[PDB]
Design a protein around this ligand. Structure first.
Ligand SMILES: Nc1nc2c(ncn2[C@@H]2O[C@H](COP(=O)(O)OP(=O)(O)O)[C@@H](O)[C@H]2O)c(=O)[nH]1
Ligand SMILES: Nc1ncnc2c1ncn2[C@@H]1O[C@H](COP(=O)(O)OP(=O)(O)O)[C@@H](O)[C@H]1O
Ligand SMILES: OC[C@H]1O[C@@H](O)[C@H](O)[C@@H](O)[C@@H]1O
Ligand SMILES: [Mg+2]
Ligand SMILES: [Mg+2]
Length: 1039
């Protein structure tokens, strides 16, 4: 499997490369060293914080202060390059840009952002689109695979199948940002997983055809789409591709007759001149691009890295696959050549005012390939006839009017031809009956240029609808989540904010811009000036979205979602009417070419108003085409892809802060994860919340059975304001920022209990023991000393001797802390504390012996007792109940502790029960064969016999142990009677060993004092020894 294999291309091209921050308490923030250059950020370290402000170190070294509201906190470096950014604590501009930057530098162009897929144009070839790549994403969910256009394509496909619902992928972005390359990938993927195959190939081959006739080199993209498109991939009930349909929008017809410097005309013109055979060149009267006015004005006839000749062969091959006949292909080329020839017709002034045509070469070449009469064409261009009552009189046009008519004819022919290709492709691919479909929208985003005309208003009007569509979708998703989880919160319809701009544009009852343009377009003697005047007269100061400029008399402003746009009214009347002289329509209707004739005969192509209609303007036509696209999208489950251009130079590895940040602000990516930040943006299943924050609260198992109760426990302990959250049916919900704060607590907490893992080793292990080993088990396998012994052996006694004061009558965790002589030279009073009794202090050891008998209502849950005394050494012990009914469980409980390799065993056994067939010592020999972590404690050395001695074990020769043996004698039952305090017993024990016929030689290595010192030492070094290993565990448990 490629997904797991590190040495796989999948990990090499789609996966990010590969305890540090664990102990660290450092927190950084993004800031711009220059308050003017808001796009340039630097990372600063935080060193101070009030109740609503931050203080941090600047790269220069100076300290700065910023309020926690305007603060752009930085996410932990561990989260750099996260597949999905929606899972980040902070989503400010710099944090978002940083995550993309990190990924982009590793050639990872795809990243998620909520219901958004972000794709940053690499402007370079990246091997992640091969068949093998496609096979890897098949079936996978958007979680088990890295971000990729294939991933959302599969999710859409699976969704269509599983929900029996149509889907749509809206791929938008600035010119050259990558919309078309991604659109093709989606089609590529679909044809592969649901598709080799005649139909499949035809669907794929329709693209080169449309790009040839609809794409061109612009200053921003060598392969710019000069039309928008919606592609429907149709499937049958079984999920197999059954067809496809294509709709085209806003083809830039003016490009055919005029291109700005360095740009080109549509690819097909250069493809035809370079790739036509010698026979085709002759028949079509071709020549080099420089010989044609429509291709020799911009200064550019070729594109670097592009072979127009090779592209022509590909285009021709595609037409064969799709099914265009040979004759049809020739007719198409004749139309392209004919247009070129029309562009070469040079009108000049005649004897009078009317234009004349001196040279007929171009006119005749055109007439020949078009299959129309030259004499008729010439008269239709310079002497078109107009209706004058019950008669028909000719109108001799001057040069300017003649030239414009020729151009209008060129644009109509190209536009019609283009619609014809699309129709022919649809006839071959579309299937009137399909069970479901996945639609892909590849169209330009908002266009805000220096000069914006009628075309820009159309594309911007389209983007107001698309943006409104996305906002409403987000609203519905949010509302559906809140309802499902029964969270009482209601938002104001997000899509409502853009209704005013839309109405200002396409509003009917209250006359909108388009309605006024249409009214004015049919007005008797209307002009662009009367048009702009009507607009100002209707919206100036009357509509908040409209603006009459201070000086310009030919422009008006519209506040669009992406900002204000100024539109020039010039030629709008003419663009909305798109006139063509009737005599030119007649001339071509009499063409001898089958295709030319259809361009003028087919109503669905030749006229905007089909059979029966009265009259329709271009604006009204597009309003309807757009309304129909929206209605189709509204029957689908939408998926969104946001393409970003890295810079404005079409260069690889060159991500520019300003250019990228600008897109993220009007693209919707930033605004998106900002519109929901008013309710409860963050929501976590109770189990997952507990599994992560159980640490911030005591008595909360990482896997509590009642996840909801545990969650409440944590929230209360942290003193979280109940208004900042809500308890859903399966998840806890949080207001914006609340989850981030809790996460910060988790980070700080973790740092305060692991920093000590760098003497004071015992207190550190103690903290970890209180945080984890409290529930009952030993997760981290902490370095500890476990005391075990048989019934009536002397455990309680010795423990009491170590404590130096009686306090004993489930596992017992005794954490002793030595209290140093007070600074006053005085001796602090000894007291005890329990973990289950947070604020209680037991200065009276009497109620401690009782409190133990209290809480003991056998269990595996340990009782955490801490004792601070100036009479004890620093030491922690785990006292386990003495050893076939319930003891059967005890043996397992014991074995559970002494099994751990990080545990030291203190075997307690009396000296009046020999060694032959002992108990504890043998029980330890099971889990510790070599006896390298077991220390024996011999008691009752005074209750042996007449001459019975035990120096044979104390010297380590009977039952040898690495840690050896230590002898001790505690109070007898009769000693417990009356006074006889532990201290007095101790004073007695010393004399016993000091003045003993045999033990006197090892006196110094005997006694409670010696035992305490030794246990402290063993524990101190054992922790030191386990320190390395334990740090590996801790780090893994917190991740
Ligand atoms: N004379 C004497 N009695 C002892 C000694 N150690 C324990 N005992 C007595 O043995 C009994 C049980 O001891 P204890 O420490 O409660 O044993 P445990 O069952 O392991 O808790 C008590 O009556 C103690 O006074 C010792 O060294 N000498
Ligand atoms: N993912 C990609 N891999 C390689 N080149 C790409 C990629 N996306 C975009 N490009 C490059 O960017 C150019 C412009 O992309 P394009 O999809 O045509 O932009 P848009 O359609 O948004 O105007 C491409 O023709 C190509 O050189
Ligand atoms: O004018 C009535 C309606 O016509 C539709 O075509 C537009 O898409 C709507 O936005 C508009 O409200
Ligand atoms: Mg494109
Ligand atoms: Mg005991």
């Amino acid at each position: 499997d490629p997904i797991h294999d590190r040495t796989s291309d999948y990990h090499k091209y789609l996966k990010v490369k590969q305890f540090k921050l664990t102990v660290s308490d450092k927190r950084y923030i993004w800031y711009n060293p220059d308050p003017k250059e808001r796009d340039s950020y630097e990372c600063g370290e935080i060193v101070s914080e009030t109740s609503d402000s931050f203080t941090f170190k600047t790269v220069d070294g100076q300290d700065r202060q910023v309020k926690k509201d305007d603060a752009n906190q930085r996410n932990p470096i561990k989260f750099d390059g996260v597949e999905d950014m929606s899972e980040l604590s902070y989503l400010n501009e710099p944090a978002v840009f940083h995550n993309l930057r990190v990924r982009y530098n590793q050639d990872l162009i795809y990243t998620y952002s909520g219901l958004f897929l972000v794709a940053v144009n690499p402007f370079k070839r990246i091997p992640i689109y091969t068949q093998e790549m496609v096979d890897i994403f098949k079936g996978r969910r958007r979680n088990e695979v890295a971000p990729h256009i294939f991933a959302i394509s599969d999710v859409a496909y699976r969704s269509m199948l599983d929900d029996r619902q149509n889907q749509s992928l809206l791929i938008t972005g600035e010119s050259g940002a990558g919309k078309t390359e991604n659109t093709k990938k989606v089609i590529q993927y679909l044809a592969s997983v649901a598709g080799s195959g005649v139909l499949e190939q035809q669907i794929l081959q329709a693209n080169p055809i449309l790009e040839a006739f609809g794409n061109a080199k612009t200053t921003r993209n060598n392969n710019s789409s000069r039309f928008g498109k919606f592609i429907e991939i149709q499937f049958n009930s079984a999920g197999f591709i059954s067809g496809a349909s294509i709709q085209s929008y806003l083809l830039e017809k003016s490009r055919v007759v005029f291109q700005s410097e360095t740009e080109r005309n549509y690819h097909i013109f250069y493809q035809l001149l370079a790739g036509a055979t010698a026979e085709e060149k002759k028949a079509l009267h071709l020549a080099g691009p420089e010989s044609f006015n429509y291709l020799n004005q911009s200064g550019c006839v070729d594109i670097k890295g592009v072979s127009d000749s090779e592209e022509f062969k590909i285009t021709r091959q595609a037409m064969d696959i799709v099914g265009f006949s040979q004759e049809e292909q020739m007719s198409i080329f004749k139309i392209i050549a004919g247009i070129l020839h029309l562009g070469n017709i040079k009108f000049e002034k005649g004897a009078g005012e009317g234009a004349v045509l001196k040279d007929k070469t171009a006119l005749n070449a055109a007439s020949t390939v078009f299959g129309v009469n030259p004499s008729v064409l010439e008269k239709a261009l310079m002497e078109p006839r107009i209706l004058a009552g019950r008669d028909l009189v000719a109108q001799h046009l001057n040069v300017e009017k003649s030239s414009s008519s020729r151009d209008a004819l060129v644009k109509a022919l190209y536009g019609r031809l283009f619609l014809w290709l699309v129709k022919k492709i649809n006839n071959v691919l579309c299937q009137e009956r399909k069970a479901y479909f996945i639609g892909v929208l590849d169209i330009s985003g908002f266009e805000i240029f220096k000069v914006n005309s009628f075309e820009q208003l159309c594309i911007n009007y389209t983007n107001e609808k698309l943006q409104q569509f996305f906002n409403h979708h987000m609203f519905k998703l949010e509302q559906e989540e809140y309802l499902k989880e029964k969270i009482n919160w209601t938002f104001i319809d997000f899509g409502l904010d853009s209704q005013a701009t839309i109405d200002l544009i396409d509003g009917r009852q209250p006359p909108g811009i388009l309605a006024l343009l249409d009214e004015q377009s049919v007005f008797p003697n209307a002009t662009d000036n009367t048009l702009i005047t009507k607009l100002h007269s209707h919206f100036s100061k009357k509509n908040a979205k409209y603006e009459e400029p201070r000086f310009s008399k030919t422009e008006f402003g519209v506040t669009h979602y992406a900002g204000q746009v100024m539109y020039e009214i010039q030629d709008w009347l003419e663009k909305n009417k798109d006139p063509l002289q009737q005599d030119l329509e007649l001339c071509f209707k009499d063409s001898s070419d089958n295709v030319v004739t259809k361009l003028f005969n087919d109503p669905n192509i030749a006229s905007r108003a089909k059979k029966g209609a009265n009259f329709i303007t271009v604006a009204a036509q597009y309003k309807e085409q757009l309304a129909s696209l929206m209605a189709t999208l509204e029957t689908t489950n939408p998926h969104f892809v946001r393409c970003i251009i890295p810079n404005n130079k079409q260069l690889p590895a060159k991500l520019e802060d300003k250019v990228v940040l600008d897109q993220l602000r009007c693209n919707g990516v930033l605004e998106g994860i900002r519109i929901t930040r008013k309710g409860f943006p963050n929501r976590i299943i109770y189990a997952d919340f507990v599994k992560r924050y159980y640490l911030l609260a005591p008595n909360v198992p990482r896997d509590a059975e009642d996840s909801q109760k545990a969650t409440d426990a944590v929230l209360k302990h942290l003193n979280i304001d109940p208004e900042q959250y809500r308890f859903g049916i399966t998840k806890i919900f949080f207001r914006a920022g609340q989850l981030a704060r809790i996460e910060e607590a988790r980070e700080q907490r973790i740092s305060e209990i692991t920093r000590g893992l760098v003497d004071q080793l015992i207190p550190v292990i103690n903290k970890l023991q209180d945080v984890f080993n409290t529930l009952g088990s030993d997760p981290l396998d902490l370095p500890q000393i476990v005391v075990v012994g048989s019934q009536s052996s002397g455990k309680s006694s010795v423990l009491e001797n170590i404590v130096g004061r009686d306090f004993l009558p489930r596992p017992l965790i005794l954490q002793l802390t030595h209290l140093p002589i007070a600074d006053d030279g005085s001796q602090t009073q000894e007291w005890g504390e329990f973990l289950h009794k947070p604020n209680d202090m037991f200065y009276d050891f009497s109620e401690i012996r009782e409190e133990i008998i209290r809480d003991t209502d056998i269990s595996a849950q340990p009782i955490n007792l801490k004792i601070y005394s100036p009479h004890v050494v620093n030491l922690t012990l785990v006292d386990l109940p003495g050893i076939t009914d319930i003891e059967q469980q005890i043996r397992r409980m014991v074995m559970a502790y002494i099994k751990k390799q990080n545990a030291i065993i203190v075997a307690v056994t009396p000296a009046n029960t020999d060694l032959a067939n002992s108990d504890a010592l043998q029980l330890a020999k099971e889990v510790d064969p070599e006896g390298k972590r077991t220390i024996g404690v011999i008691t009752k050395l005074d209750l042996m016999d007449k001459g019975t001695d035990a120096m044979e074990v104390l010297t380590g020769r009977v039952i040898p142990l690495t840690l050896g043996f230590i002898g001790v004698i505690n109070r007898s039952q009769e000693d417990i009677i009356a006074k006889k305090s532990i201290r007095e017993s101790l004073k007695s024990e010393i004399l016993y060993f000091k003045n003993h016929p045999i033990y006197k030689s090892i006196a110094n290595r005997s006694g409670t004092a010696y035992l305490s010192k030794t246990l402290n030492k063993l524990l101190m070094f054992h922790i030191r020894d386990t320190l390395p290993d334990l740090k590996v565990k801790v780090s893994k448990m917190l991740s």
